[PDB]
């Protein structure tokens, strides 16, 4: 109902949901078994991913992606695209001649899974590298930590 | 117009130079691999097929 919003049927490819059963087991509950995996590197699977019902092939926990490479951090700056946000990474570049530094920044478009909700602008996000998901997206959100002003 | 005639049973070739329009009339408007009766060439070629 709410999940089915596209012209094509949204399904989890590795789950077979047409297994026939007796009439007694049909009355109990129509609860599809969820597919999820541990991504490794000490990151825990959010409870909303295990208990959720969303369909996302690019989700690091319930989708077909692999996390390998560099693990980076950023601050959420824009949330206006579908399932992907823009974060900003700030740093200092050293100039040898003057023995000083200058402030520089980069912008990253990263994929945000539906399992992460209540994400606001200005909170810290830990992302991991994966295969290119689109023209400009190469990283996926792995952890979200709130800002210092959380009450 | 020259004619290079080959006899395969004996395997003998001969080049004959013909200056006559009548002798060449029967060969005009013919495609390759077609069979023609070479009677117009002269009195020697009575019954020959080329």
């Amino acid at each position: 109902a709410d999940i089915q919003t596209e012209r094509a049927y949204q399904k989890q490819p590795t789950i077979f949901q047409n297994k026939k059963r007796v009439l007694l087991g049909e009355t109990g509950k129509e609860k599809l078994p969820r597919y999820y995996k541990n991504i490794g590197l000490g990151f825990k699977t959010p409870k909303e991913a295990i208990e959720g019902t969303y369909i996302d092939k690019k989700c690091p926990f319930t989708g077909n992606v692999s996390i390998r490479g560099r693990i980076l951090s950023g601050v959420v700056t824009k949330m206006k695209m579908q399932r992907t946000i823009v974060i900003r990474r700030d740093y200092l570049h050293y100039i040898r001649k003057y023995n000083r530094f200058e402030k520089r920044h980069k912008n990253m478009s990263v994929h945000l899974s539906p399992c992460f909700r209540d994400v606001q602008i200005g909170d810290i996000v830990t992302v991991g590298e994966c295969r290119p998901l689109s023209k400009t997206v190469r990283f996926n959100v792995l952890k979200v930590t709130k800002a210092a002003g959380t009450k | 117009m020259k004619l290079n005639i080959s006899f395969p049973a004996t395997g003998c070739q001969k080049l004959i130079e013909v200056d006559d329009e009548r002798k060449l009339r029967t060969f005009y408007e013919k495609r390759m691999a077609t069979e023609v009766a070479a009677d117009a060439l002269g009195e020697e070629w009575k019954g020959y097929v080329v």
Partner: protein, 262 residues
């Protein structure tokens, strides 16, 4: 380029071949084989530069085409054949056997061995995988694939192979307290005992080694080759036991040798 490259500039050759600059423009590009291009020793370099048997490249070919040289018990006529670590070279015409082992300077050394020792070699387990019909397969550092290995053998272990039959005789497990040699990096050619292993998920592991004299160093996990169990190696060692001397004590040893000469 539009395809594979077939030449090798002499100045771009590996520096452990000890080639001189003014001899020519090119260096023998190693053929494809069990060992990597940057981690092997071509047959011609060992045959004319190390042993001084031949003077030119033509004489190396004249020696090789008489089927005199054997590598791991098999006759090789290729003069650029890549010969690598822990390989056995046999010359039956002169009755000589050699094993390619790094010295403390990180160069392959001319190390003569007993013909009894020339019957086996040590290999490092690189891969373990189950193939069709549920048959285990083991892949070593020198591209050897062996079927039905011992179930206790895992990666980073050492196996002893009999060169005649190519079958495992025994093995050494990768555990702390064993004897190992470094096969790459800054500590190449050093021999010691493993102290501890640091595990970094998603990255390279770091292993610490301590030599006989008590000097400690560290390397990556891929650069370590287990030689013997405990303090006893399973192969013969070169003149240097794997202990790297400093420049000061090398100078002291050289001066002492000069003083005692004459």
């Amino acid at each position: 380029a539009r395809g594979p490259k077939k030449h090798l500039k002499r100045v771009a050759a590996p520096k452990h071949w000890m080639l001189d600059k003014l001899t020519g423009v090119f260096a023998p590009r190693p053929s494809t084989g069990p060992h990597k291009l940057r981690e092997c020793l071509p047959l011609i370099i060992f045959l004319r530069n190390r042993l001084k048997y031949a003077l030119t490249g033509d004489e190396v070919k004249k020696i090789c085409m008489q089927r005199f040289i054997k590598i791991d018990g098999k006759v090789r006529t290729d003069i650029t054949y890549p010969a690598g670590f822990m390989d056995v070279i046999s010359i039956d015409k002169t009755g000589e056997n050699f094993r390619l082992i790094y010295d403390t300077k990180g160069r392959f050394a001319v190390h003569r061995i007993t013909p009894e020792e020339a019957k086996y070699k040590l290999c490092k387990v690189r891969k373990i995988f189950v193939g069709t019909k549920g048959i285990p397969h083991l892949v070593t550092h020198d591209a050897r694939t062996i079927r039905y290995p011992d179930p206790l053998i895992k990666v980073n272990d050492t196996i002893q192979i009999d060169l005649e039959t190519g079958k495992i005789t025994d093995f050494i497990k990768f555990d702390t307290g064993n004897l190992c040699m470094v096969t790459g990096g800054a500590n190449l050619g050093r021999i010691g005992v493993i102290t501890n292993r640091e595990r970094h998920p998603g990255s390279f592991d770091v292993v610490h080694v301590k030599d006989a004299n008590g000097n400690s160093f560290a390397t990556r996990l891929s650069n370590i080759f287990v030689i013997g169990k405990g303090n006893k190696p399973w192969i013969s060692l070169p003149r240097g036991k794997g202990i790297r001397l400093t420049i000061a004590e090398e100078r002291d040893k050289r001066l002492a040798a000069k003083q005692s000469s004459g």
